[PDB]
RNA sequence: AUCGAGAGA
């Protein structure tokens, strides 16, 4: 009921620490469920054409 | 750049083969694979020079480095007459003989599998892996070998070649075992699941002996000379007594 | 409440169409059953919380 | 608090099927006492399963 | 709803037989196997598809908004 | 254009290369190495698709000398087509005839 | 060794039987990976005929507008597919259909109630007008110059009495469906078979003579007309072996499965390809065959 | 997900000439790989499969209510007794053929209807 | 105010039924099929007491 | 050139488990402590008890290419050629030793007096078997 | 008793109780027990297992002690006990078929399967209940089979060409 | 934004 105060901001789990300085919100990735497959290597992930639009990286020209 | 290489160098897939909790390894093929490896790697598979050559480029691609030695190479048969044949632990050797490096001596490993001698016949000797130089020659390839177990073919080329090589391995079984796995398909059904006539009789023999255990339990748990009725009063009262008793109820679950 | 299923399918309801649920906003609700002690009978309990509950209280 | 382990089971019933050895399988079929014990049995691993999942939560952090 | 054109397993058109299975089980008294016999169905992937529809248009269609009830 | 030549994985003198076919299967890919085999000259001969999801072939031929290996998939093309042929022909002699 | 030459001396065909509809033929002392190949291509590489692009204009029914032009597309039609050419689709809608690629059916079908229908009936064809929709509404309309190729052929369904929609009075559907050429590896749609497999000839190989009592039980564990007597001595033999679907009842008599094995003639295949309706199983064949020495034709003569 | 709680996500649209093909000519729409069986121990899935298959061949819808077999009357002596009379074998097991390669596969594949 | 009660649960009483719980006594009758509409009818629940508690008896 | 051979009397033959291979117990006729335990592929060759075999170990048959026309071999006098790798040697007991091969997973165990099986050296030795 | 529950005659009537039937064995007709005289009632599961001077009573068919949803399972008798549980608490999170009248509501999210069939294999309570009229699921040809290496976990594969017939399809 | 119901691993 009590409005929280500027100490309740940063006392537990849901307050700034836990959850805004020892766990954040990231740009640049992705989510989606797994399937299976056995012709990439095993050391590799395969990426769906719509997270391979998506994602980018800075490569500066040379 | 600088958490790329971190990511291909310090976190990535193959250098984590085994786990710092005890030392074991964590990454290997699972279900499928491991089937298909042991009807592959069985003295009843034989192949032609086709089906031979067909399973080696369809494991190993050269053109995708796969191969260290820029030409696939191959072995003499285990066969020569009346028409040659190749075996399935051939298959292995060539695997291994294509993608370890060459200028170094293959692997000399002797370990054992999960399956016993008893499962192959009388005098048979496929529990007892070995390799030498590279060549598996005797024994069956296994979970123990490829998956994650301790001291199999993957953790031996692991320790001996890097954990490129390891990997490597990895991606080239599983690409072999699921090539098998589709010509030679693997299936279950309810006949695996039926006993034989004599099987049922015996089950029903033995578990014919159950239908007074719990009564000879409850009796020697109340203390009570064998051979008591089971609608005993004194038993009753006892069985009343455990009832209302957490402990002793315990002691006659144990029992029984 | 004695509609047949012809009558309900002529209202637009459906052919076989079941009640115990009302409508609140456009939005179906049910009154979930619950499970509570047996009415009119003393039933004799064991709790801590009575201990708990002050001081001589077994 | 009757002795009874089932409805169907007599007071008291010194038998192993009442008191839940299913002498049953999953070729044949179980009958429905031994249906009614192994569901209690699956309840529980259920149960046991969803507590451990997370019991040893705060352990790993109050460590790290 | 409404019965598949086409068997899912094989391809053979199964939709043009819906009205004659129910003519062949209503008309005469031929139990579903010798019905589906005789509407040349062999395969039990093509069997299963006139067997076990449920033609729930039938139903879906006494909701009609565009006609006085 | 439809067949490639993997350069990475050729013999310098040509006894030995890889070949990529772009929208191809195990349709050709099995019927080509089947009349490939029956080269007396040919060491090995296998096909291989890296993913099913794309539409490539992958053909390794190496033989034994005096020849290549492209011109080892020419004769066994060639083949091919003539088993075709004769079973064309013999297929149309038996409908005829009946 | 072998060769063409060989291969042609060793060859041999045996048509059981051809209908419009179903061929049953056998390949003999071939190889599984050629017979695979004339499969896979009848399965999924001859081209036919069907509705792809559906142009809904109206559709106040139950089903939905996905749906109905899915049922359609999976309607085979009675068309050569010789006698049109395939879209080019880079190009842009406005020209990418022609009079010689694409054949344009309609749909214009409007429920309304029978004010005869008799006190008490129930029958949907009795109670209203256009209740059921089939196939053969499907009316096809001749664009450009085609009007003058299709005049001896018109373009029907396969099957005229699929069961296409159902309607109620008041609910009109009014469509127009394009359908071009396609293989059946691109949709099954397009697939011109039902199915078209093979399987290898049963071998049923006696080992131990069979006599009396024993044959009788022997003869009925197979297909009745696989097994037979022989006159003279009361053995048992193998008649037609093309009779016999592997069940393997045999096996489960201790009695017999120490004296029959069973296997298969592995260079000896039993066709049986199944049409959809737009062209004859034989031409299937044909042109599977066609299609893998064209497709070997075109990779050796593309330059590597 | 049948009706035994075997759920599981689909991986791939495996095309049909690519899919095994037995020797009636049927290619199977759903393809369950048997080492999901042993961990689970649905044997339900394997007797609902045996029965789907009797059904659709002869026409008839099988009732599977629990508890109306026991030991000595066993489902799949009561199916595989319809099976056999239909002419397929006792045991379910249907003699298929690869599809990439095109030889009889090692042994005969399980298969039949299930929900 | 019983709209309210069966919109959001909530037992708003002065004096307080003989029950434990205040909250969560309607839940949405979801039409996914029919079989979970029906069983949503056959449902009887313990409470949302004993959610948030450890002993499992 | 050869290194082993003698005329082999088998007594017991059993599939265990297996279709195509199976493994022998062949005692010599000749030498009286001489005996071996084989497996052989019986559907390209096939044995029953109380037959008798012509073994012969060689160390060639005068990289592998198919037989092709006027080519000449020690395999043309043989029925069932194999070839393996001899992995071990050991000490029955005195002038007793037995030697270990195993063709490409199907093992033998030779066993014999150390005159006869001295040539036997632990490398790659083919195996030729004659009705 | 010794020690147990107070001895007692508890007649019980009105609301909210639970009642099942049950046959008295006696004259050989229906009775409704409730969970506080069950207890220490003999109710035989099956006629064949009935002892003389032991049981009053007897189930009129095992299977009226599941819910609805387990008794629609097939074969469940045969089952791992959890795998009926999420068969249970899968068969209401299927995209089967809400009711017929769907074009008089106007709900926030409604998951509708085309094309159901009736299953081959069927409890005799699935015609009582009607749920033909709802159809879940559909019939496919499913085999026990490693073939693809794409199925191994938990995963599976579904022919493209039934796929691209409408199997499976929904709204 | 908060508290209630539920769902996936
Ligand atoms: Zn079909």
Redesign the pocket.
Request: proline share 5%; net charge negative; with cysteine.
């Given at each position: 009921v009590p409005i929280?105060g500027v100490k309740q901001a940063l006392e537990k789990k849901?307050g700034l620490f836990r959850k805004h300085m020892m766990g954040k919100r990231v740009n640049y990735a992705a989510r989606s469920v797994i399937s299976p497959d056995p012709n990439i290597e095993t050391n590799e992930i395969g990426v769906p054409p719509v997270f391979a639009v998506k994602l980018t990286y800075p490569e500066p020209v040379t | 750049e600088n958490a790329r290489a971190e990511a291909l160098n310090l976190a990535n897939t193959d250098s984590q083969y085994l786990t710092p909790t005890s030392g074991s390894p964590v990454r290997g093929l699972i279900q499928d694979h491991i089937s298909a490896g042991v009807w592959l790697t069985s003295k009843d598979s034989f192949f032609t020079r086709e089906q031979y050559q067909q399973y080696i480029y369809g494991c190993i691609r050269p053109e995708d480095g796969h191969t260290t030695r820029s030409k696939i190479v191959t072995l003499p048969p285990t066969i020569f007459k009346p028409y040659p044949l190749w075996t399935g632990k051939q298959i292995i050797t060539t695997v291994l003989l294509n993608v370890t490096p060459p200028d170094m001596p293959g692997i000399n490993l002797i370990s054992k599998n999960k399956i016993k001698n008893e499962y192959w016949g009388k005098g048979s000797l496929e529990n007892e892996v070995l390799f030498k130089d590279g060549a598996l020659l005797c024994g069956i390839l296994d979970k123990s070998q490829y998956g994650a177990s301790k001291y199999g073919i993957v953790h031996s080329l692991h320790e001996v070649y890097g954990p490129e090589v390891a990997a490597k391995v990895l991606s080239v079984l599983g690409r072999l075992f699921t090539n098998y796995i589709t010509a030679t398909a693997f299936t279950c059904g309810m006949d695996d699941l039926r006993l034989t006539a004599e099987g049922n009789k015996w089950r029903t023999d033995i578990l014919k002996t159950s239908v007074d255990t719990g009564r000879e339990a409850a009796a020697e748990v109340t203390n009570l000379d064998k051979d008591t009725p089971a609608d005993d009063p004194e038993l009753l009262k006892r069985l009343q007594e455990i009832l209302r008793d957490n402990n002793k109820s315990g002691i006659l679950d144990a029992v029984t | 409440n004695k509609m047949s299923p012809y009558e309900l399918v002529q209202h637009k309801e459906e052919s076989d169409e079941i009640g115990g649920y009302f409508i609140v906003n456009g939005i179906e609700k049910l009154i979930?059953m619950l499970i509570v002690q047996r009415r009119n009978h003393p039933m004799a309990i064991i709790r801590p919380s009575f201990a708990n509950r002050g001081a001589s209280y077994s | 608090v009757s002795g009874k382990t089932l409805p169907s089971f007599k007071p008291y019933e010194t038998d192993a099927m009442a008191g839940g050895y299913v002498k049953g399988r999953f070729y044949s079929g179980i009958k429905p006492q031994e249906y009614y014990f192994h569901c209690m049995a699956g309840r529980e691993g259920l149960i046991d399963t969803?507590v451990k999942?997370?019991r040893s939560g705060y352990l790993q952090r109050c460590l790290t | 709803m409404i019965v598949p054109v086409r068997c899912f397993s094989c391809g053979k058109v199964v939709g043009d037989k819906w009205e004659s299975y129910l003519n062949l089980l209503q008309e005469d008294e031929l139990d579903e196997g010798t019905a589906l016999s005789r509407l040349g169905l062999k395969r039990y992937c093509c069997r299963r598809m006139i067997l076990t529809h449920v033609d729930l248009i039938e139903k879906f269609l006494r909701y009609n908004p565009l006609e006085k009830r | 254009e439809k067949i490639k030549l993997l350069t990475q994985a050729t013999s310098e003198d040509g006894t030995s290369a890889s070949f990529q076919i772009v929208e191809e299967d195990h349709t050709l890919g099995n019927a080509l190495r089947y009349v490939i085999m029956k080269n007396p000259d040919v060491e090995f001969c296998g096909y291989s698709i890296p993913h099913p999801s794309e539409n490539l072939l992958n053909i390794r031929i190496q033989t034994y000398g005096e020849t290549t290996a492209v011109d080892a998939l020419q004769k066994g093309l060639k083949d091919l087509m003539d088993l075709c042929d004769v079973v064309e022909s013999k297929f149309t002699e038996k409908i005829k005839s009946m | 060794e072998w060769n063409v030459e060989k291969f042609k001396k060793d060859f041999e065909v045996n048509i059981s039987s051809l209908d419009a509809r179903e061929a049953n033929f056998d390949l003999i002392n071939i190889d599984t990976s050629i017979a695979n190949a004339f499969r896979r291509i009848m399965i999924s590489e001859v081209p036919s005929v069907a509705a792809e692009y559906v142009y809904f204009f109206n559709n106040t029914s139950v089903i939905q507008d996905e749906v109905l032009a899915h049922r359609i597309g999976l309607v085979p039609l009675k068309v050569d597919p010789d006698m049109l050419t395939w879209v080019d689709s880079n190009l842009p809608d406005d020209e990418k259909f022609t009079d010689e690629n694409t054949i344009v059916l309609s749909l214009n079908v409007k429920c309304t109630r029978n004010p005869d229908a008799p006190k008490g009936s129930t029958d949907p064809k009795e109670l209203y007008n256009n209740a059921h929709v089939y196939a053969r509404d499907l009316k096809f309309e001749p664009q450009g110059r085609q009007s003058t190729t299709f005049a001896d052929c018109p373009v029907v369904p396969a099957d005229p009495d699929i069961l296409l929609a159902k309607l109620r009075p008041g609910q009109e559907i009014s469509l127009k469906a394009h359908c071009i050429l396609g293989i059946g590896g691109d949709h099954a749609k397009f697939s011109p078979v039902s199915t078209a497999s093979y399987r290898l000839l049963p071998q049923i190989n006696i080992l131990q003579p069979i006599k009396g009592e024993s044959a009788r039980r022997f003869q009925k564990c197979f297909p009745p007309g696989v097994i037979g007597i022989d006159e003279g001595s009361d053995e048992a033999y193998v008649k037609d072996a093309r009779k016999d679907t592997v069940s393997r009842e045999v096996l489960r008599y201790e009695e017999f499965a120490d004296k029959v094995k069973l296997g298969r003639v592995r260079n000896h295949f039993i066709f049986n390809v199944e049409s959809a309706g737009a062209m004859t199983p034989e031409e299937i064949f044909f042109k599977s065959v066609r299609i893998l020495k064209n497709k070997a034709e075109y990779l050796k003569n593309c330059p590597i | 997900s049948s009706r035994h709680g075997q759920?599981g996500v689909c991986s791939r649209k495996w095309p049909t000439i690519d899919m095994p093909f037995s020797e009636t000519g049927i290619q199977p729409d759903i393809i369950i790989n048997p080492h999901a069986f042993p961990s689970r121990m649905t044997i339900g899935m394997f007797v609902e499969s045996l029965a789907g298959k009797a059904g659709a061949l002869h026409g008839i819808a099988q009732d599977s209510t629990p508890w109306i077999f026991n030991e000595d009357d066993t489902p799949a002596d009561y199916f595989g007794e319809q099976l056999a009379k239909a002419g397929y074998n006792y045991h379910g097991n249907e003699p298929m053929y690869s599809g990439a390669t095109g030889e009889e596969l090692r042994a005969d594949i399980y298969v039949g209807v299930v929900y | 105010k019983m709209q309210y009660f069966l919109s959001?649960?909530?037992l708003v009483s002065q004096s307080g039924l003989d029950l434990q719980?205040?909250?969560?006594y309607?839940?949405?009758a979801?039409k996914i099929n029919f079989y979970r509409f029906i069983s949503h009818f056959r449902?009887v629940?313990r409470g949302?007491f004993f959610?948030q508690l450890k002993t499992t008896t | 050139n050869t290194l082993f051979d003698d005329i082999f009397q088998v007594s017991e033959v059993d599939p265990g488990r297996y279709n195509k291979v199976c493994r022998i117990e062949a005692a010599s006729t000749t030498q009286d402590q001489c005996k071996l335990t084989l497996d052989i592929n019986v559907e390209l060759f096939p044995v029953a008890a109380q037959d008798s075999l012509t073994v012969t170990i060689a160390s060639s048959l005068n990289s592998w290419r198919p037989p092709q026309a006027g080519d000449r071999s020690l395999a043309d006098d043989y029925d069932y050629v194999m070839y393996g790798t001899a992995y071990k040697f050991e000490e029955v007991s005195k002038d007793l030793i037995a030697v270990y091969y195993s063709f490409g997973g199907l093992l033998m165990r030779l066993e014999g007096n150390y005159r006869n099986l001295n040539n036997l050296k632990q490398e790659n030795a083919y195996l030729l078997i004659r009705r | 008793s010794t020690r147990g529950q107070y001895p007692g005659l508890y007649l019980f009537g009105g609301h909210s109780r639970m009642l099942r039937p049950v046959r008295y064995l006696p004259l050989d007709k229906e009775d409704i027990v409730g969970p506080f005289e069950q207890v220490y009632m003999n109710i035989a599961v099956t006629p064949q297992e009935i002892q003389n001077n032991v049981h009053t009573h007897v189930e009129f068919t095992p299977t009226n002690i599941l819910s609805i949803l387990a008794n629609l399972t097939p074969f469940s008798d045969f089952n791992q006990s959890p795998r009926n549980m999420?068969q249970c608490?899968?068969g209401?999170?299927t995209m089967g078929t809400p009711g017929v009248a769907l074009c008089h509501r106007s709900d926030n999210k409604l998951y509708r399967l085309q094309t159901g069939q009736t299953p081959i294999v069927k409890a005799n309570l699935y015609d009582d209940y009607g749920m033909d009229n709802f159809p879940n699921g559909f019939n496919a040809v499913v085999a026990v089979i490693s073939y693809t290496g794409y199925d191994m976990d938990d995963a599976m594969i579904i022919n493209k060409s039934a796929d691209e017939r409408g199997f499976g399809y929904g709204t």
């Amino acid at each position: 009921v009590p409005i929280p105060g500027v100490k309740q901001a940063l006392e537990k789990k849901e307050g700034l620490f836990r959850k805004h300085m020892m766990g954040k919100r990231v740009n640049y990735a992705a989510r989606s469920v797994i399937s299976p497959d056995p012709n990439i290597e095993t050391n590799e992930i395969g990426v769906p054409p719509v997270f391979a639009v998506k994602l980018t990286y800075p490569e500066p020209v040379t | 750049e600088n958490a790329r290489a971190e990511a291909l160098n310090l976190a990535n897939t193959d250098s984590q083969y085994l786990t710092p909790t005890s030392g074991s390894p964590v990454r290997g093929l699972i279900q499928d694979h491991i089937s298909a490896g042991v009807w592959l790697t069985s003295k009843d598979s034989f192949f032609t020079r086709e089906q031979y050559q067909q399973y080696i480029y369809g494991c190993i691609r050269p053109e995708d480095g796969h191969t260290t030695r820029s030409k696939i190479v191959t072995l003499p048969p285990t066969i020569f007459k009346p028409y040659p044949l190749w075996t399935g632990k051939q298959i292995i050797t060539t695997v291994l003989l294509n993608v370890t490096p060459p200028d170094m001596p293959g692997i000399n490993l002797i370990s054992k599998n999960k399956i016993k001698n008893e499962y192959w016949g009388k005098g048979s000797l496929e529990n007892e892996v070995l390799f030498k130089d590279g060549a598996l020659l005797c024994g069956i390839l296994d979970k123990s070998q490829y998956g994650a177990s301790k001291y199999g073919i993957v953790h031996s080329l692991h320790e001996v070649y890097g954990p490129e090589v390891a990997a490597k391995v990895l991606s080239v079984l599983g690409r072999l075992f699921t090539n098998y796995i589709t010509a030679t398909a693997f299936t279950c059904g309810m006949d695996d699941l039926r006993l034989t006539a004599e099987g049922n009789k015996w089950r029903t023999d033995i578990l014919k002996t159950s239908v007074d255990t719990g009564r000879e339990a409850a009796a020697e748990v109340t203390n009570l000379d064998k051979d008591t009725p089971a609608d005993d009063p004194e038993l009753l009262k006892r069985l009343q007594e455990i009832l209302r008793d957490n402990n002793k109820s315990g002691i006659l679950d144990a029992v029984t | 409440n004695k509609m047949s299923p012809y009558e309900l399918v002529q209202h637009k309801e459906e052919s076989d169409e079941i009640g115990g649920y009302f409508i609140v906003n456009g939005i179906e609700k049910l009154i979930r059953m619950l499970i509570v002690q047996r009415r009119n009978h003393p039933m004799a309990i064991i709790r801590p919380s009575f201990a708990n509950r002050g001081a001589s209280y077994s | 608090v009757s002795g009874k382990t089932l409805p169907s089971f007599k007071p008291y019933e010194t038998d192993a099927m009442a008191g839940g050895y299913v002498k049953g399988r999953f070729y044949s079929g179980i009958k429905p006492q031994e249906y009614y014990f192994h569901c209690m049995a699956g309840r529980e691993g259920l149960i046991d399963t969803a507590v451990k999942t997370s019991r040893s939560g705060y352990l790993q952090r109050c460590l790290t | 709803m409404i019965v598949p054109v086409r068997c899912f397993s094989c391809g053979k058109v199964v939709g043009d037989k819906w009205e004659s299975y129910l003519n062949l089980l209503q008309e005469d008294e031929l139990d579903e196997g010798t019905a589906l016999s005789r509407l040349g169905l062999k395969r039990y992937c093509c069997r299963r598809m006139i067997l076990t529809h449920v033609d729930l248009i039938e139903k879906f269609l006494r909701y009609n908004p565009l006609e006085k009830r | 254009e439809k067949i490639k030549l993997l350069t990475q994985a050729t013999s310098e003198d040509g006894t030995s290369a890889s070949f990529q076919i772009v929208e191809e299967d195990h349709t050709l890919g099995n019927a080509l190495r089947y009349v490939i085999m029956k080269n007396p000259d040919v060491e090995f001969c296998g096909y291989s698709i890296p993913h099913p999801s794309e539409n490539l072939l992958n053909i390794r031929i190496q033989t034994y000398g005096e020849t290549t290996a492209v011109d080892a998939l020419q004769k066994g093309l060639k083949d091919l087509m003539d088993l075709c042929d004769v079973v064309e022909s013999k297929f149309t002699e038996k409908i005829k005839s009946m | 060794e072998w060769n063409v030459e060989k291969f042609k001396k060793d060859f041999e065909v045996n048509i059981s039987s051809l209908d419009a509809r179903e061929a049953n033929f056998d390949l003999i002392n071939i190889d599984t990976s050629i017979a695979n190949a004339f499969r896979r291509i009848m399965i999924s590489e001859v081209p036919s005929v069907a509705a792809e692009y559906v142009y809904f204009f109206n559709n106040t029914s139950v089903i939905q507008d996905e749906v109905l032009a899915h049922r359609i597309g999976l309607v085979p039609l009675k068309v050569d597919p010789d006698m049109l050419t395939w879209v080019d689709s880079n190009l842009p809608d406005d020209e990418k259909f022609t009079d010689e690629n694409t054949i344009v059916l309609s749909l214009n079908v409007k429920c309304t109630r029978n004010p005869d229908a008799p006190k008490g009936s129930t029958d949907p064809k009795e109670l209203y007008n256009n209740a059921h929709v089939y196939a053969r509404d499907l009316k096809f309309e001749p664009q450009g110059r085609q009007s003058t190729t299709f005049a001896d052929c018109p373009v029907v369904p396969a099957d005229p009495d699929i069961l296409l929609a159902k309607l109620r009075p008041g609910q009109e559907i009014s469509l127009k469906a394009h359908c071009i050429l396609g293989i059946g590896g691109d949709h099954a749609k397009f697939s011109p078979v039902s199915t078209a497999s093979y399987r290898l000839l049963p071998q049923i190989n006696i080992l131990q003579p069979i006599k009396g009592e024993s044959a009788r039980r022997f003869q009925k564990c197979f297909p009745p007309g696989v097994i037979g007597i022989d006159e003279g001595s009361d053995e048992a033999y193998v008649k037609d072996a093309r009779k016999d679907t592997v069940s393997r009842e045999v096996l489960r008599y201790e009695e017999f499965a120490d004296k029959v094995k069973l296997g298969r003639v592995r260079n000896h295949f039993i066709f049986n390809v199944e049409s959809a309706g737009a062209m004859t199983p034989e031409e299937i064949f044909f042109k599977s065959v066609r299609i893998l020495k064209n497709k070997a034709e075109y990779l050796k003569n593309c330059p590597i | 997900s049948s009706r035994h709680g075997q759920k599981g996500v689909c991986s791939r649209k495996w095309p049909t000439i690519d899919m095994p093909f037995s020797e009636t000519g049927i290619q199977p729409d759903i393809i369950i790989n048997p080492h999901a069986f042993p961990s689970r121990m649905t044997i339900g899935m394997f007797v609902e499969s045996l029965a789907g298959k009797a059904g659709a061949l002869h026409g008839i819808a099988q009732d599977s209510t629990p508890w109306i077999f026991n030991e000595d009357d066993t489902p799949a002596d009561y199916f595989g007794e319809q099976l056999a009379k239909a002419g397929y074998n006792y045991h379910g097991n249907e003699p298929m053929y690869s599809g990439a390669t095109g030889e009889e596969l090692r042994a005969d594949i399980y298969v039949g209807v299930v929900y | 105010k019983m709209q309210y009660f069966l919109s959001t649960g909530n037992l708003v009483s002065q004096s307080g039924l003989d029950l434990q719980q205040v909250s969560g006594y309607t839940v949405v009758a979801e039409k996914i099929n029919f079989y979970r509409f029906i069983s949503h009818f056959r449902m009887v629940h313990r409470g949302s007491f004993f959610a948030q508690l450890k002993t499992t008896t | 050139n050869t290194l082993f051979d003698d005329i082999f009397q088998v007594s017991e033959v059993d599939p265990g488990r297996y279709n195509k291979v199976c493994r022998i117990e062949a005692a010599s006729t000749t030498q009286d402590q001489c005996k071996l335990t084989l497996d052989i592929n019986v559907e390209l060759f096939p044995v029953a008890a109380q037959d008798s075999l012509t073994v012969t170990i060689a160390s060639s048959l005068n990289s592998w290419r198919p037989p092709q026309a006027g080519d000449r071999s020690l395999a043309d006098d043989y029925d069932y050629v194999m070839y393996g790798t001899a992995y071990k040697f050991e000490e029955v007991s005195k002038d007793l030793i037995a030697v270990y091969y195993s063709f490409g997973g199907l093992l033998m165990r030779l066993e014999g007096n150390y005159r006869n099986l001295n040539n036997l050296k632990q490398e790659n030795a083919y195996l030729l078997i004659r009705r | 008793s010794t020690r147990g529950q107070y001895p007692g005659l508890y007649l019980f009537g009105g609301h909210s109780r639970m009642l099942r039937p049950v046959r008295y064995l006696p004259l050989d007709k229906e009775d409704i027990v409730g969970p506080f005289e069950q207890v220490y009632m003999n109710i035989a599961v099956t006629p064949q297992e009935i002892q003389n001077n032991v049981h009053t009573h007897v189930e009129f068919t095992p299977t009226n002690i599941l819910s609805i949803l387990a008794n629609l399972t097939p074969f469940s008798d045969f089952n791992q006990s959890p795998r009926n549980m999420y068969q249970c608490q899968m068969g209401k999170q299927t995209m089967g078929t809400p009711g017929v009248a769907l074009c008089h509501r106007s709900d926030n999210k409604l998951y509708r399967l085309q094309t159901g069939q009736t299953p081959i294999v069927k409890a005799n309570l699935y015609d009582d209940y009607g749920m033909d009229n709802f159809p879940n699921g559909f019939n496919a040809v499913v085999a026990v089979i490693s073939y693809t290496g794409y199925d191994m976990d938990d995963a599976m594969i579904i022919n493209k060409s039934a796929d691209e017939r409408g199997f499976g399809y929904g709204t």
